[PDB]
Amino acid sequence: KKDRVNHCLTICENIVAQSVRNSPEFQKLLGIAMELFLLCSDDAESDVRMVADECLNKVIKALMDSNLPRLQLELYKEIKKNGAPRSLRAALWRFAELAHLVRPQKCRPYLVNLLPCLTRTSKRPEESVQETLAAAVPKIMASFGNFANDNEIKVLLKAFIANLKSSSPTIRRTAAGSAVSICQHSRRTQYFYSWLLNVLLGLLVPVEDEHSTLLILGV
């Protein structure tokens, strides 16, 4: 049991103070440390996960002045690989908590990289990944959504409107919240509210059809 707690907790105790930062050794050591903790965030024992959670948090707090863009590249890579659900969640909400710290010269390429991730994470059936994405979208879009174009936004809105028919109340809540927020943090808010109303009325407008209770509840 405890051996991997001693390993990650001593890796956390070390890397906050090792060597000089921005060196060619420290970039590698920090990559391996994030890879190790995000893996330990999905290990099969309770106190191991709680210690991995406080190891990621202490290391981000310690290195924000100096390695913020590398921390966000490591968290993004764990989102990109779409793995086990606690491993994905442990990266996703942390990336969303850091999203305001990216410099304006770095928002556009993260917008382009995250839409393939958000549109894969909305296709995950597990409700805890969805409750995490429901928190992440209103923070991600408030940090990147003015850097999107209209076709990129319409791809996100389509990916969440597809979920309004779901049997899970949580999936419908995640979609209903995400779609309105994606519009709200666009460069074109009044147009996107108009487009989203045309979709939402359009989904119930042929009022004689056998619409499902699930789709009505989402809309």
């Binding site: 930062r21 921005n22 002045d65 100096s66 390695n67 913020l68």
Partner: peptide, 17 residues
């Protein structure tokens, strides 16, 4: 981190004139 770190060249000095 910063643009002196990224450009790999030094910060200046504080002095009166």
């Amino acid at each position: 981190x910063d643009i002196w770190c990224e450009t790999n060249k030094q910060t200046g000095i504080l002095v009166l004139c």
